[PDB]
Amino acid sequence: SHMCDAFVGTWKLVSSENFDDYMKEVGVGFATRKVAGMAKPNMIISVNGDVITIKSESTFKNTEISFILGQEFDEVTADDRKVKSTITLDGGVLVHVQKWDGKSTTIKRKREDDKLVVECVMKGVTSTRVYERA
Ligand SMILES: O=C(O)c1cccc(OCc2ccccc2)c1OCc1ccccc1
């Protein structure tokens, strides 16, 4: 259906801004922040029918989610939170909400020029992570 075509591919992190403060807001402890902040993940996005798969491969952790838009699922995040996630498309932006322990964070993924831009928000704190084609 050509849903999410422009996201599909293999992407490499090239910049991160304010990720330490985002992780602090999420509740990540010191050692995980330091090590996770160093990581330069490879994000691999694929689509098969209605199922979107996003993998993240790095020195810190290899993670993978598969999902159908609008349909809640279980995700264990790289920092080991057990969250309930729902991902939708809003005007061409993938919007991913994670719920756990009465908390919530929202991750947006957008195509901007030749980049895939990831915006991570926890209360008033945003981090921006920019990926390029690998
Ligand atoms: O860049 C991504 O694709 C990404 C998208 C949404 C949330 C993420 O981190 C959540 C998070 C919250 C709290 C702690 C770590 C990660 C992400 O980094 C994963 C990551 C980061 C570092 C190392 C490996 C993988």
Swiss-Prot record:
Q: What GO CC annotations are associated with the protein?
A: cytoplasm; cytosol; extracellular exosome; lipid droplet; nucleus
Kindly list the places in or outside the cell where this protein is found, as annotated in its UniProt entry.
Cytoplasm; Nucleus
Q: Might you name a Gene Ontology BP term for this protein?
A: cellular response to lithium ion
Phosphotyrosine PTM positions read: Y22
Q: Which PROSITE patterns match?
A: FABP
- Residue window of motif Nuclear localization signal: 24-34
Keywords of this entry: Acetylation, Cytoplasm, Lipid-binding, Nucleus, Phosphoprotein, Transport
Binding, a fatty acid = R129, V130, Y131
Per the record, the major location class is cytoplasm
One Pfam family matching this protein: Lipocalin
**Stored Gene3D superfamilies:** 2.40.128.20
Domain text: Forms a beta-barrel structure that accommodates hydrophobic ligands in its interior.
- Subunit description: Monomer. Homodimer. Interacts with PPARG.
Family assignment from sequence similarity: Belongs to the calycin superfamily. Fatty-acid binding protein (FABP) family.
- What function is annotated for this protein? Lipid transport protein in adipocytes. Binds both long chain fatty acids and retinoic acid. Delivers long-chain fatty acids and retinoic acid to their cognate receptors in the nucleus.
Q: What is this protein called?
A: Fatty acid-binding protein, adipocyte
The taxonomic lineage of its organism, from the top, reads: Eukaryota, Metazoa, Chordata, Craniata, Vertebrata
- Gene name, per UniProt, is FABP4
